């Protein structure tokens, strides 16, 4: 699993066209104020262990930034060892559940399987942009 | 070299704190309307050949999107095989020059070696977000 942590002043997205034959989540849109936006690429061989490590780290980074909202944003573009869409969806669902066991704030999992438009204002501080990998 | 192509409706950035002891470019800020924003991570072993392949591809993708502005945005976070900062800066300078030989529109190389704040509104169409790697 490959992740990009973006500490945002604000974030919003809207699904547009389906990116998969049949997206496993319904379409939608949401917007937020200050949040950690976690661009999440599920990789082949990610399993429950991988999810749990990632959940703990997101939690720990969120605490360090004093943020109370995390967006789990499915992203197909952070690596060249993608898991297939069904495995990917499953792991993102597990990640959402796992994060709630480690982090007390708002967790928003954005829909999987769509192209999206988005807008973000990413903060300038030294820890506002970082990437992290997890495996098992 | 690892790149992320974001077709934006608008883009802006501002350097904040120096991210390197002595950043090789001066601080600054710019904003744009419709542009291809190329988050660019220089990797160990990128050379002139790598640059030229990347320049041709950016050019060809820009043409396909009918965009006339490309932002070359130094980004340290797209892979785990980073070139050292001096090699990285050099390659980004080469990339800027190479792109101008292949693409007729506005090429803006954003400064290297700073933390930055940025804001982007990324389009929803199917080719609005893609990643590409180049090597030699
Ligand atoms: N291995 C993987 N990890 C994370 N997400 C993955 C995935 N495989 C498929 N997806 C999802 O399906 C959409 C099309 O690839 C993806 N959509 C996106 O990447 C949009 N942000 C592009 O606008 C994503 O929702
Ligand atoms: N291998 C590499 N490829 C591309 N850029 C690289 C690099 N090594 C260092 N940099 C630059 O130095 C800043 C701190 O890493 C980097 N700054 C950034 O990545 C900001 N957008 C974070 O806010 C970047 O300008």
PDB file of C-alpha atoms in Angstrom, chain A residues 2-6 10 14 16-17 39 73 75-80 115-131 133, chain B residues 2-6 10 14 16-17 39 73 75-80 115-131 133:
ATOM      1  CA  UNK A   2       1.304   3.448  -1.003  1.00  0.00           C
ATOM      2  CA  UNK A   3      -0.128   6.598   0.648  1.00  0.00           C
ATOM      3  CA  UNK A   4       0.321  10.338   0.224  1.00  0.00           C
ATOM      4  CA  UNK A   5      -0.589  12.451   3.305  1.00  0.00           C
ATOM      5  CA  UNK A   6      -1.767  15.957   2.404  1.00  0.00           C
ATOM      6  CA  UNK A  10      -9.903  22.517   2.747  1.00  0.00           C
ATOM      7  CA  UNK A  14     -17.188  15.062  -6.746  1.00  0.00           C
ATOM      8  CA  UNK A  16     -18.012  12.245 -12.393  1.00  0.00           C
ATOM      9  CA  UNK A  17     -17.948   9.316 -14.812  1.00  0.00           C
ATOM     10  CA  UNK A  39      -4.467   9.485  -1.220  1.00  0.00           C
ATOM     11  CA  UNK A  73      -9.271   9.006  -0.856  1.00  0.00           C
ATOM     12  CA  UNK A  75      -6.249   6.833  -5.728  1.00  0.00           C
ATOM     13  CA  UNK A  76      -5.063   4.574  -8.541  1.00  0.00           C
ATOM     14  CA  UNK A  77      -1.916   6.512  -9.417  1.00  0.00           C
ATOM     15  CA  UNK A  78       0.712   6.290  -6.619  1.00  0.00           C
ATOM     16  CA  UNK A  79       2.434   3.078  -7.683  1.00  0.00           C
ATOM     17  CA  UNK A  80       2.953   0.481 -10.409  1.00  0.00           C
ATOM     18  CA  UNK A 115     -13.203   9.497 -11.921  1.00  0.00           C
ATOM     19  CA  UNK A 116     -13.367  12.547  -9.737  1.00  0.00           C
ATOM     20  CA  UNK A 117     -12.923  16.242  -9.800  1.00  0.00           C
ATOM     21  CA  UNK A 118     -11.371  17.647  -6.690  1.00  0.00           C
ATOM     22  CA  UNK A 119     -10.048  20.751  -5.163  1.00  0.00           C
ATOM     23  CA  UNK A 120      -7.506  20.979  -2.307  1.00  0.00           C
ATOM     24  CA  UNK A 121      -5.588  23.697  -0.545  1.00  0.00           C
ATOM     25  CA  UNK A 122      -2.559  22.024   0.869  1.00  0.00           C
ATOM     26  CA  UNK A 123      -0.670  23.653   3.758  1.00  0.00           C
ATOM     27  CA  UNK A 124       2.882  24.874   3.471  1.00  0.00           C
ATOM     28  CA  UNK A 125       4.382  23.512   6.673  1.00  0.00           C
ATOM     29  CA  UNK A 126       7.207  20.923   6.610  1.00  0.00           C
ATOM     30  CA  UNK A 127       4.995  17.936   7.466  1.00  0.00           C
ATOM     31  CA  UNK A 128       2.095  18.944   5.247  1.00  0.00           C
ATOM     32  CA  UNK A 129       3.093  16.539   2.434  1.00  0.00           C
ATOM     33  CA  UNK A 130       4.639  13.110   3.067  1.00  0.00           C
ATOM     34  CA  UNK A 131       4.309   9.632   1.547  1.00  0.00           C
ATOM     35  CA  UNK A 133       4.272   2.598   2.326  1.00  0.00           C
TER      36      UNK A 133
ATOM     37  CA  UNK B   2       8.065   9.326 -11.738  1.00  0.00           C
ATOM     38  CA  UNK B   3       5.422  11.878 -12.834  1.00  0.00           C
ATOM     39  CA  UNK B   4       1.797  12.581 -11.976  1.00  0.00           C
ATOM     40  CA  UNK B   5      -0.173  14.499 -14.665  1.00  0.00           C
ATOM     41  CA  UNK B   6      -3.000  16.597 -13.218  1.00  0.00           C
ATOM     42  CA  UNK B  10      -6.531  26.361 -11.971  1.00  0.00           C
ATOM     43  CA  UNK B  14       3.738  29.641  -2.885  1.00  0.00           C
ATOM     44  CA  UNK B  16       7.174  28.803   2.406  1.00  0.00           C
ATOM     45  CA  UNK B  17      10.129  27.509   4.414  1.00  0.00           C
ATOM     46  CA  UNK B  39       4.302  16.629 -10.222  1.00  0.00           C
ATOM     47  CA  UNK B  73       6.295  21.041 -10.202  1.00  0.00           C
ATOM     48  CA  UNK B  75       7.793  16.889  -5.947  1.00  0.00           C
ATOM     49  CA  UNK B  76       9.786  14.701  -3.567  1.00  0.00           C
ATOM     50  CA  UNK B  77       7.012  12.242  -2.741  1.00  0.00           C
ATOM     51  CA  UNK B  78       6.102  10.059  -5.774  1.00  0.00           C
ATOM     52  CA  UNK B  79       8.654   7.291  -5.292  1.00  0.00           C
ATOM     53  CA  UNK B  80      11.176   5.634  -2.980  1.00  0.00           C
ATOM     54  CA  UNK B 115       8.137  23.475   1.148  1.00  0.00           C
ATOM     55  CA  UNK B 116       5.123  24.872  -0.603  1.00  0.00           C
ATOM     56  CA  UNK B 117       1.509  25.612  -0.108  1.00  0.00           C
ATOM     57  CA  UNK B 118      -0.606  24.995  -3.141  1.00  0.00           C
ATOM     58  CA  UNK B 119      -4.099  24.926  -4.373  1.00  0.00           C
ATOM     59  CA  UNK B 120      -5.408  22.974  -7.396  1.00  0.00           C
ATOM     60  CA  UNK B 121      -8.755  22.254  -8.964  1.00  0.00           C
ATOM     61  CA  UNK B 122      -8.305  19.060 -10.852  1.00  0.00           C
ATOM     62  CA  UNK B 123     -10.720  18.168 -13.669  1.00  0.00           C
ATOM     63  CA  UNK B 124     -13.007  15.176 -13.555  1.00  0.00           C
ATOM     64  CA  UNK B 125     -12.512  13.747 -17.029  1.00  0.00           C
ATOM     65  CA  UNK B 126     -10.998  10.266 -17.557  1.00  0.00           C
ATOM     66  CA  UNK B 127      -7.543  11.513 -18.583  1.00  0.00           C
ATOM     67  CA  UNK B 128      -7.336  14.273 -15.997  1.00  0.00           C
ATOM     68  CA  UNK B 129      -5.145  12.216 -13.618  1.00  0.00           C
ATOM     69  CA  UNK B 130      -2.486   9.761 -14.825  1.00  0.00           C
ATOM     70  CA  UNK B 131       1.032   8.779 -13.739  1.00  0.00           C
ATOM     71  CA  UNK B 133       7.585   6.693 -15.406  1.00  0.00           C
TER      72      UNK B 133
END
